[PDB]
Write a protein that binds this ligand. Structure first.
Ligand SMILES: O=c1cc(NCCCNCc2cc(Cl)cc(Cl)c2)[nH]c2ccccc12
Length: 496
């Protein structure tokens, strides 16, 4: 009955969808699905971040309006979510009116808390470095020109701007990191954030005057909101903010923001400060994943390797939170061994033995031997290990525990030699076949959030009713003898 709210970072649709976008959607989709099967009421959100000057100039470059350009490009990110079999319950675009109103509400709420003032962004700026510097990092040379520490000229620049009093929240954020050690993860991000905040926080510019493609500042519409309040507010726009009576508002606070490593500071410093200012509770965890390197277009990978092969490799091979690598032979070999061979072929060998030798019915199992109990108890244990792993977003440890059972089951099945038992002891052959099919059922229920369509097909050839596929069914709904099984077909074909 318990509510669970999980989000992805909204993607910037200035170019095409890339692997990093698909990686974050897949990882967050698997976490969302995991909690649904674990019995939770899940709301899972993703979307697009469409405002800004770079978007306005690209619309200018193509001869169309910014809103028109946003509609065109987000359509490909909306297509990517569908191709990846994402279970997101909503899709937020910052160009939508509900976000416009949500952003203006949270802005006013921060004005009402005393945290927003109008000022100036004046300082030394190097066009060559694209960076700002304090006066002390500079020196005027024999040129008569002033130079920054990198050896390039700096110029004095001055812009009008609204600010958020970020300096007022330095101590409250450190209190947050002390009272909730799991607020920013993994541990390396946590230490980055703590060291940054502990060194002193300056007030934060949150408005621009150089473009109208954005959300107008209430009461000064020559100014528009910068990315900070715009993008981050998407998390509460999707719940109906500012209408706190919306049925969806009970989902706040978010249980988990899944983000990339590069935007850690925006979600772990700016976002909680905005919320504290606006009198709102804080999300329970922000988790940052790493970056993927080809050691490439997401649509192409899916067509070449298959969706569930790609989902598996990305979540099994990179410890979630770290940088990782992908390559053709690695995807092929890792998916051939685990999916096509270990999982897929174990099902085919065992279940076609049931079709030919047990008349297409789940055999009636006799007494369980010591080996029978070990593989069954290991399968039950993998659920508990997977649960504890997913609580920490350790997706690879969850898949590792599940596929350690698959590998042990192959050794169990080969060690029982049920083909030899067909003549010596048909009743024993049945029990071994029952054990193997029963382990496949528990594994099949458990891999549903990581490879949903493939897991669905596996549970389909085990004749598992659609209402017996929650995680609670691992322990409570074992296969019943005498049940009719459809003719088995391979679930994981080998790569060509
Ligand atoms: O200049 C802008 C650029 C922009 N998108 C750039 C890519 C966003 N970076 C990823 C990101 C994602 C999230 Cl969820 C939150 C933040 Cl703060 C940042 N978004 C903008 C929105 C309003 C006004 C200006 C901009």
């Amino acid at each position: 009955r318990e509510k669970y709210y999980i989000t992805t970072a909204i993607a910037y649709p200035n170019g095409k969808p890339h692997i990093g976008h698909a990686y974050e959607l897949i990882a967050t989709d698997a976490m969302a699905r995991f909690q649904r099967l674990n019995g939770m009421d899940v709301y899972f959100l993703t979307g697009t971040d469409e405002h800004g000057i770079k978007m306005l100039q690209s619309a200018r470059k193509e001869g169309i309006t910014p809103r028109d350009l946003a509609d065109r490009n987000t359509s490909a990110f909306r297509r990517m979510a569908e191709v990846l079999n994402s279970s997101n319950d909503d899709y937020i675009r910052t160009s939508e009116e509900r976000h416009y109103k949500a952003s203006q509400a949270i802005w006013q709420a921060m004005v009402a808390n005393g945290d927003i003032y109008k000022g100036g962004y004046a300082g030394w700026y190097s066009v060559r470095d694209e960076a700002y510097y304090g006066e002390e990092e500079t020196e005027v040379r024999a040129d008569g020109v002033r130079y920054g520490p990198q050896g390039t000229p700096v110029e004095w620049v001055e812009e009008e701007s609204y600010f958020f009093r970020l300096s007022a929240y330095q101590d409250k954020l450190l209190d947050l990191y002390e009272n909730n050690p799991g607020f920013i993860m993994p541990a390396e991000r946590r230490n980055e954030i703590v060291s940054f905040v502990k060194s002193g926080l300056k007030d934060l510019s949150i408005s621009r005057t150089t473009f109208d493609w954005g959300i107008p500042v209430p009461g000064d519409e020559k100014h528009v909101m910068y990315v900070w309040v715009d993008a981050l507010t998407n998390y509460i726009t999707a719940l109906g903010y500012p209408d706190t009576t919306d049925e969806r508002w009970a989902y706040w606070p978010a249980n988990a923001h899944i983000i990339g490593k590069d935007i850690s500071r925006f979600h772990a410093v700016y976002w909680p400060a905005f919320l504290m200012s606006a009198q709102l509770p804080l999300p329970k965890r922000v988790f940052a994943h790493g970056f993927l390197f080809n050691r490439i277009d997401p649509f192409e990978l899916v067509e070449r390797y298959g969706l569930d092969q790609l989902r598996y490799f990305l979540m099994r091979e990179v410890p979630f939170g770290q940088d990782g690598s992908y390559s053709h032979e690695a995807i092929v070999n890792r998916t051939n061994a685990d999916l096509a061979n270990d999982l897929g072929n174990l099902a085919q060998r065992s279940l076609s033995m049931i079709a030919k030798n047990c008349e297409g019915k789940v055999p009636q199992p006799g007494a369980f031997s010591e080996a029978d109990k070990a593989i069954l108890d290991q399968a039950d244990a993998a659920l508990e290990t997977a649960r504890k792993a997913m609580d920490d977003q350790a997706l690879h440890l969850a898949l590792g525990a599940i596929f350690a059972v698959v590998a042990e089951a192959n050794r169990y099945f080969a060690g029982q030699e049920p083909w030899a038992l067909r003549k010596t002891d048909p009743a024993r052959m049945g029990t071994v076949l029952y054990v193997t099919a029963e382990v496949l059922r528990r594994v099949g229920i458990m891999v549903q959030p990581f490879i949903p369509q493939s897991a669905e097909k596996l549970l389909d050839i085990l004749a598992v009713p659609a209402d017996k596929r929650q995680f609670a069914d691992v322990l409570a709904s074992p296969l019943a003898g005498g049940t009719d099984l459809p003719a088995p077909q391979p679930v994981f074909p080998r790569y060509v």
